[PDB]
Design a protein around this ligand. Sequence first.
Ligand SMILES: Nc1ncnc2c1ncn2[C@@H]1O[C@H](CSCC[C@H](N)C(=O)O)[C@@H](O)[C@H]1O
Ligand code: NA
Lengths: 265, 265
Amino acid sequence: MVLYFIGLGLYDERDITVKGLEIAKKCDYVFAEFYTSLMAGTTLGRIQKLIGKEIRVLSREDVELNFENIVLPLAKENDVAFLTPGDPLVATTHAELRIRAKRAGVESYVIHAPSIYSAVGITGLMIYKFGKSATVAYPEGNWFPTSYYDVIKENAERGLHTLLFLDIKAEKRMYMTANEAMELLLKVEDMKKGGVFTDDTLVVVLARAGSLNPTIRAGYVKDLIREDFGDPPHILIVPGKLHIVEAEYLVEIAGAPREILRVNV
Amino acid sequence: MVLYFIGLGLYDERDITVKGLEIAKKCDYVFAEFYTSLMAGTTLGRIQKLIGKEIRVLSREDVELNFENIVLPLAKENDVAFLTPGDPLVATTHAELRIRAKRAGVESYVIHAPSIYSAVGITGLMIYKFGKSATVAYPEGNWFPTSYYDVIKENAERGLHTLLFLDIKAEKRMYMTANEAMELLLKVEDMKKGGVFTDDTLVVVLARAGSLNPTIRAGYVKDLIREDFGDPPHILIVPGKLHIVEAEYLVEIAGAPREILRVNV
Ligand SMILES: Nc1ncnc2c1ncn2[C@@H]1O[C@H](CSCC[C@H](N)C(=O)O)[C@@H](O)[C@H]1O
Ligand code: NA
């Protein structure tokens, strides 16, 4: 009679919360999806071992189309777990899945886990200063999306920080690097000429959040555009005017150049 | 020989990540603070039991004024952990404590935990649509804080949602409720008369996120301002222009007025 939406966390199989692990262990069936995002620091096998249950993986179609035929039927007479990377209902559309559960007469509960939305606090950037978020998507064919450029403009205009999710082809396990995102943004700048993103723009890169050894770097596009930030996933941030405290953290912790203490404050 | 910033989670001792627990179990000394947020579903004892270590609780003054005198000295010869509610670097100034660690020659690591900042995803409001965040602070003496009113205005104009952290006076066991936040906002409205927060404003309340049965409610201020949302902690959200899919969830899951289903395009 119960369906548990359980967050897997940021990076590896230890990023799930104790609550989520123990509940997953007591469930009769455990499902998981890896199409909204991936757990770059672990594997299905490792996660299976930790939980001590076989995990049935579901595709985007299995969920978006046949969630009530695959998952809900079992949740009617058993305790079922549905695992997803990060924090459940975060940057996803699983929210409506709770409505599907309701109409099928199934109870559902959410077991939270860290999300990059909050994890980016490790960059030293104050959380309240973040504005609207966006995703940088790969252009393809005759399609060149640029709305993320406008989000940065509107945020920075109000002194707010912009969290930019980088394109990911989950099924193919292909990551867009921060380097690629920067190249894309410069190209967009060249087309819109808004003065939003240039070689002089200060950016922050967070790689492998959740890992004990994440890469946290800050500097101007001209110097970071070709830097190696390590293995994905990469997250790009375009800070607005930093607070003194923010800049100091970037310099002391993210190796930012002293120059930001006077140019970006 | 290192210092661990470990988040404890939203509600109870089990909201810590498995990563955080295993690491905390092997530390020589464990410190903590419980003034930045309220974990309404656990106690110091339970946390101590789970981690299997005695925990020395610090006050805001101990941290802000003497962190390098109390904690850092031990971290020079031992493995030390500093525990906090939710995520240690979200809506706190703890980030700066990493700079102090550096100067003391102490390497520090951060272990994330579920945060209210991402847990709001359970309201059904899309996380990317949130703008600048703010805190509703208790007025003290002749001093009546009001900036949070302008944050709402700026966000709403942009059709963005506004997350409002509520005040907390831990040493006095005072936890601002959504009801008090609302009362204060109506007062600010009467003064600034910007038409930002009135009896007809649609709001969302999330209480005790992290527990299995949090209170999730959406509705007009006139109807919710005197509603009982249960024990603290609470957060208040003033949504921007709602997406049809956000409205549906608010209605089906948060008991919102069915009329919000009719969005004015
Ligand atoms: N479990 C919870 N449920 C509802 N609100 C919460 C909450 N935990 C924190 N809050 C909100 O956040 C405020 C504290 S600010 C500190 C947040 C913490 N660092 C975190 O990452 O979660 C509380 O006063 C309340 O307004
Ligand atoms: Na945000």
